[PDB]
Ligand SMILES: CC(C)[C@H](C(=O)O)[C@@H](O)C(=O)O
Ligand SMILES: CC(C)[C@H](C(=O)O)[C@@H](O)C(=O)O
Ligand SMILES: [Ca+2]
Ligand SMILES: [Ca+2]
Ligand SMILES: [Cl-]
């Protein structure tokens with residue numbers, strides 16, 4: 013009946029932008045008659061401060077009792093010296109992905125109208141625009157392969173990670189890419205290193221097996237070094253990019269940065285069962301925390317992804333997305349979206365969330 | 377006394393641009409009194425056509441008898457359907473790297489004066505310019521880690537690669553990055569995934585050990601997803617980038633493509649003993665082969681790297697490099713370096729090589 017959401021705002025800008033997401037969710041709950049209940053739990057640096065680890069057992073159990081995770085961001089200079097395997101970012105996100113089998117990471121990156129000038133692309137390339145979905149496999153490959161560790165001492169001491177994929181793992185992520193391409197521009201570009209990696213050979217093989225179920229989707233394969241070049245040059249030629257864990261990590265971020273506007277971008281990590289973790293694409297931005305400056309759009313759109321993907325509340329998801337569009341087209345842009353000669357029009361985080369919740373309320 | 381060079385021109389544009397490199401080498405041999413002897417050997421697609429494999433035993437022995445490999449490029453649509461582990465590119469380059477212990481890959485990427493407009497960067501970013509050396513570890517990590525293969529059948533069939541580094545391997549590549557930074561702008565940015573990979577943890581550790589020998593070089597560490605974002609945005613803040621095999625593969629290419637002019641860029645792969653493989657950064661470009669269009673500068677500068685690094689002919693190396701500079705600043709640019717309204721000034725491959733050998737002869 014009534015949904016349960018684990019709210020894991022984390023560090024840096026996380027709590028202030030989460031507050032705006034929740035404000036917009038409040039407008040949406042009222043308009044569509046949704047009963048969503050939320051519990052906040054510490055994660056990342058605040059969980060190390062409050063509890064000794066980045067992912068407290070109680071945060072984890074709070075997530076198991078939820079229909080979805082509304083996730084902020086984690087990490088910060090204060091923990092940026094700890095043992096890698098106790099650090100907040102990887103300490104929160106990987107065990108969360110692993111525990112809940114969040115194998116599928118979706119990060120759509122589009123160049124928004126009017127914001128071309130912010131993209132780091134040459135103006136004729138950004139004028140062409142782009143819209144690229146990164147479908148990234150999230151629970152296997154080299155992130156979670158075993159053996160992983162190190163042996164020896166001295167010069168001969170060595171450390172090792174194993175990159176591993178099974179046909180089952182590749183085909184379930186491929187299907188996601190293919191179904192997504194179907195509702196977009198019907199191209200999957202599968203990104204691998206099949207000239208080098210036994211994993212990438214099986215990857216490329218399996219993805220071709222899956223393509224039989226999609227006669228309407230065009231499939232092409234590309235090496236990750238090649239894909240990263242080609243995205244700087246002609247991002248407009250890609251529709252869906254299907255990648256393994258390590259390659260999609262690189263690619264999702266690259267494409268996000270080519271937008272020039274990461275504060276507008278969000279991410280859905282999902283398991284096969286409808287449960288997911290929804291977060292902004294960009295970091296916790298500790299330099300701007302507590303100052304009313306952070307763009308809450310990324311976090312607000314994470315909430316929209318949460319409603320659509322985990323809560324089956326498509327209408328409520330699209331209302332938020334249209335309220336965001338409304339803001340971007342009505343002079344409601346935070347400072348990092350504005351050119352330096354326009355930066356005086358900058359809206360604060362709270363102003364951004366107020367406007368966007370108001371637009372939902374007004375029936376946008 | 378007299379040097380011996382294995383000339384492995386390969387496929388596509390390889391032979392035509394190699395011809396220009398050799399023309400320029402002829403001018404240089406005459407001017408500095410160098411006795412270099414060359415033998416040509418098939419590699420890549422022409423070696424599959426002529427001999428059944430991308431790296432004939434006799435090509436390999438020809439390389440063992442040489443002081444250096446002057447390498448063109450390999451690959452082409454004609455072989456672009458073969459078993460990955462028989463394909464020309466990986467079939468030529470990895471066994472060459474492995475056999476001769478070419479652990480160190482150097483690819484400097486600079487934005488040339490007057491060519492800013494070609495870079496895919498937004499004009500204010502390309503106007504800032506950049507000069508980034510990728511130091512990439514070439515003989516270990518995941519390219520050559522074992523175990524590598526696959527087991528099983530059906531859904532549960534899995535393929536695996538092991539990413540492996542020893543302290544010895546990391547420290548010898550780190551030293552190269554550090555010595556290079558010393559003669560540049562004294563910063564090494566070491567690029568890893570230490571939040572995820574046991575290899576990257578040891579990587580980051582060891583590189584910090586090496587930094588003690590270089591109190592004058594600034595060291596920083598960065599994740600590969602982060603490094604790839606930051607290079608699109610502010611390439612000017614990096615001096616030397618120190619990477620493992622898989623990450624440096626991605627990064628070298630990304631940075632090369634950010635120049636907008638890959639046909640000017642070259643690569644040195646070297647072992648500890650002075651022997652190396654010298655090649656252009658860019659592919660074999662089969663669409664433009666045999667038409668007199670390919671930019672030979674990349675291959676001509678590979679020859680210069682060959683002279684400096686393997687042949688201890690610094691003066692001859694710098695003469696070629698100045699002859700190239702002379703061409704770029706005297707209206708001798710091939711078509712892909714020219715804006716479409718200027719493309720009528722385009723010089724052919726042969727014209728490019730003639731000019732550049734003439735400049736060496738003239739005492740540039
Ligand atoms: C913090 C890190 C482990 C994580 C990853 O590599 O998955 C991050 O880079 C991401 O994009 O979620
Ligand atoms: C062909 C391929 C195996 C090779 C590599 O990955 O090393 C290439 O991408 C490179 O940059 O040399
Ligand atoms: Ca990332
Ligand atoms: Ca490459
Ligand atoms: Cl992976």
Ligand SMILES: [Cl-]
Pocket residue numbers: 516517518519539620621622623
């Ligand atoms: Cl590697």
